[PDB]
Amino acid sequence: TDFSKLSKYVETLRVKPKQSIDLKKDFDTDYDHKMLTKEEGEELLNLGISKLSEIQEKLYASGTKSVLIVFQAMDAAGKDGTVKHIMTGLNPQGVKVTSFKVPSKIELSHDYLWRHYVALPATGEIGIFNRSHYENVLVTRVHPEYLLSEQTSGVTAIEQVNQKFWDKRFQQINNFEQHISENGTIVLKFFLHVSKKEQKKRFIERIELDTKNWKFSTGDLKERAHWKDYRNAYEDMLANTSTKQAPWFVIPADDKWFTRLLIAEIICTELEKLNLTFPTVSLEQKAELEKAKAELVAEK
Numbered sequence: 001t002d003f004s005k006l007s008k009y010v011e012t013l014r015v016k017p018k019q020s021i022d023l024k025k026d027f028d029t030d031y032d033h034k035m036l037t038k039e040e041g042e043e044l045l046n047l048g049i050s051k052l053s054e055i056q057e058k059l060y061a062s063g064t065k066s067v068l069i070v071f072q073a074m075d076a077a078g079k080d081g082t083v084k085h086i087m088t089g090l091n092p093q094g095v096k097v098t099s100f101k102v103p104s105k106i107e108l109s110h111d112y113l114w115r116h117y118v119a120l121p122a123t124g125e126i127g128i129f130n131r132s133h134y135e136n137v138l139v140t141r142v143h144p145e146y147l148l149s150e151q152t153s154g155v156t157a158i159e160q161v162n163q164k165f166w167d168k169r170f171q172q173i174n175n176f177e178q179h180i181s182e183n184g185t186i187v188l189k190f191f192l193h194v195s196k197k198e199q200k201k202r203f204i205e206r207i208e209l210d211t212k213n214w215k216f217s218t219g220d221l222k223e224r225a226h227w228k229d230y231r232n233a234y235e236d237m238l239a240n241t242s243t244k245q246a247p248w249f250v251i252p253a254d255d256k257w258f259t260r261l262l263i264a265e266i267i268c269t270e271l272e273k274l275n276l277t278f279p280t281v282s283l284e285q286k287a288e289l290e291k292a293k294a295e296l297v298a299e300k
């Protein structure tokens with residue numbers, strides 16, 4: 001197999017600007033078995049990694065563009081695993097992961113974007129965000145009371161948190177992603193879409209295996225109970241912050257190998273639009289390289 005069948009499926013995963021979203025209805029969380037096999041995918045996935053390494057190697061040397069890659073997802077979605085697998089084939093000098101956590105005091109003394117702007121990737125580098133500024137329209141939207149404890153949010157009472165407030169954030173975010181898009185950054189955003197069913201399965205597997213037992217937090221359940229509120233926030237974000245510049249992609253997360261294949265595939269596709277090449281050796285340089293070979297060969 002090859003990428004022929006998949007390539008049309010991928011197009012559906014892109015979120016078109018301002019198209020309405022029904023996550024339960026429209027977007028699946030498991031792969032259709034009629035498309036590919038787990039074995040076929042593992043082979044293509046492997047091509048994806050090697051091809052992504054070539055791109056990264058050319059991106060580093062070209063030093064013209066940076067790449068920002070966002071991963072947003074519910075707990076047990078497979079973010080960390082996805083990040084890890086994608087970075088296994090890359091060179092660690094041109095790639096940084098930043099796994100954003102609950103803000104620090106210093107971070108809350110700044111606008112909510114500041115800690116993200118600070119962590120942006122440089123020319124020739126790939127930055128990966130395991131969670132992002134989009135947390136400020138997700139967990140914060142499910143729990144508006146947090147806003148009261150962010151001095152910079154400008155939210156003094158809970159009643160001033162309305163759809164106009166989130167529209168204003170979408171705009172802020174969109175302006176942010178537009179400015180960096182206009183200044184060298186290729187932004188790609190992935191929503192790893194895991195279903196309640198598979199989340200419950202993974203949560204239990206985590207709770208039964210001693211290797212993962214110690215790690216499991218019970219607060220993850222508090223957020224599962226707000227599934228519907230999270231679905232509302234995701235759907236609204238997706239509709240208002242996916243652009244042709246900074247597109248969102250909804251990726252099914254119930255089958256991990258398949259999640260990893262799609263993401264690898266989409267990153268390659270989007271970065272191939274840059275037409276990256278290794279630098280060419282001029283005649284002058286080729287002559288210098290050949291003088292050096294001669295010197296080495298003519299050693300006592």
Ligand SMILES: Nc1nc(=O)c2ncn([C@@H]3O[C@H](COP(=O)(O)OP(=O)(O)OP(=O)(O)OP(=O)(O)O)[C@@H](O)[C@H]3O)c2[nH]1
Nearest residue numbers: 075076077078079080081100101102103131135136139146
């Ligand atoms: N209030 C607040 N404001 C913010 O700006 C912000 N940014 C991030 N976060 C919170 O940091 C927590 C990150 O901790 P975590 O439980 O270690 O998340 P993961 O390990 O990636 O899930 P996992 O189960 O390991 O997922 P995978 O298996 O897919 O890796 C999450 O609850 C986020 O809501 C924020 N909270």
